[PDB]
Amino acid sequence: QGHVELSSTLLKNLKNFKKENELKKIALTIIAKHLCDVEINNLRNIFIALDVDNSGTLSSQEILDGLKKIPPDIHQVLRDIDSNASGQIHYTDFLAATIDKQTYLKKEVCLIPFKFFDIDGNGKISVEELKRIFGRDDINPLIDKAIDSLLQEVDLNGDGEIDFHEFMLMMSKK
């Protein structure tokens, strides 16, 4: 009542995606590819309304025209999309970046990327398995630094592996 805030869940997630850790971003992409239309219905409807040229992708102009036809945080998102390979955000990546914890933060949902990452099925993501998510396990000191930084942040018990409880906690954060 009076002057209030009805914040956009879709925009909050969209601006937060880039800054999420690299494991969470891939887990969110896997989740987005597995959720059915009933679970992402609001995001699908918005994407269709914005995708005026039916390209299956959104440009910065389509997103900008939507904030008009229908802040520094949203302006940075537009510049981040302009800077990527195609100058666009594909449907799947848009869903990954906009899906909310209310939808994804559930054991049944997070088990989808977790089981995929856990190659041997021992309930833990080893350093080798973790490296295999991002690139070839044969080829770099920058890769080792990124893995070490990812492990510090996620491997709470410091046993050099990622269990399901640690995976759920990381998925909830930020």
Residue 124 among known ligand-binding residues: yes
Q: Does the footprint of Cl ion cover residue 108 (CB under 5 A)?
A: no
Q: Does the footprint of Ca ion cover residue 152 (CB under 5 A)?
A: no
CB of 26 to Ca ion, least distance (A): 16
CB of 23 to Cl ion, least distance (A): 7
Choose the contact partner of 155 out of Cl ion, a copy of itself, Na ion, none; CB within 5 to 8 A by kind. none
> Which two structure tokens, joined as six digits, stand for 105?
């933060």
Q: Does the footprint of Na ion cover residue 150 (CB under 5 A)?
A: yes
CB of 51 to Na ion, least distance (A): 11
86 neighbors 57 (Cβ within 8 angstroms):
yes
* Bridge partner list, 58: 89
Q: Does the footprint of a copy of itself cover residue 53 (CB under 8 A)?
A: yes
> Which two structure tokens, joined as six digits, stand for 80?
């981040």
Is the four-CA dihedral 19, 24, 25, 29 of positive or negative sign? negative
DSSP one-letter string for 119-156? SS-SSEE-HHHHHHHHS-S---HHHHHHHHHHHHHH-T
Residue 155 among known ligand-binding residues: yes
Chain contacts with Cl ion (rule: CB under 5 A) = 21-22, 54, 150, 164
